[PDB]
C-alpha cells in the first residue's frame, strides 16, 4: 500500500 503524500 501507499500511505502518505504523493
UniProtKB/Swiss-Prot annotation:
Stated family: Belongs to the RRM TET family.
Post-translational modifications reported in the UniProt record: Phosphorylated in its N-terminal serine residues upon induced DNA damage. ATM and DNA-PK are able to phosphorylate FUS N-terminal region.
Quaternary structure annotation from Swiss-Prot or TrEMBL: Self-oligomerizes (via N-terminal region). Oligomerization is essential for chromatin binding. Component of nuclear riboprotein complexes. Interacts with ILF3, TDRD3 and SF1. Interacts through its C-terminus with SFRS13A. Interacts with OTUB1 and SARNP. Interacts with LRSAM1. Interacts with SAFB1 in a DNA-dependent manner; this interaction tethers FUS to chromatin. Interacts with MATR3. Interacts with SNRNP70 and POLR2A; these interactions couple RNA transcription and splicing.
UniProt protein name: RNA-binding protein FUS
Illness association: A chromosomal aberration involving FUS is found in a patient with malignant myxoid liposarcoma. Translocation t(12;16)(q13;p11) with DDIT3. A chromosomal aberration involving FUS is a cause of acute myeloid leukemia (AML). Translocation t(16;21)(p11;q22) with ERG.
Annotated tissue distribution: Ubiquitous.
Subcellular location: Nucleus
Organism: Homo sapiens
Protein purpose: DNA/RNA-binding protein that plays a role in various cellular processes such as transcription regulation, RNA splicing, RNA transport, DNA repair and damage response. Binds to ssRNA containing the consensus sequence 5'-AGGUAA-3'. Binds to nascent pre-mRNAs and acts as a molecular mediator between RNA polymerase II and U1 small nuclear ribonucleoprotein thereby coupling transcription and splicing. Also binds its own pre-mRNA and autoregulates its expression; this autoregulation mechanism is mediated by non-sense-mediated decay.
Top-rank taxon, per record: Eukaryota
Modified residues (Phosphoserine): 6
Amino acid at each position: 500500500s501507499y500511505s502518505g503524500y504523493s
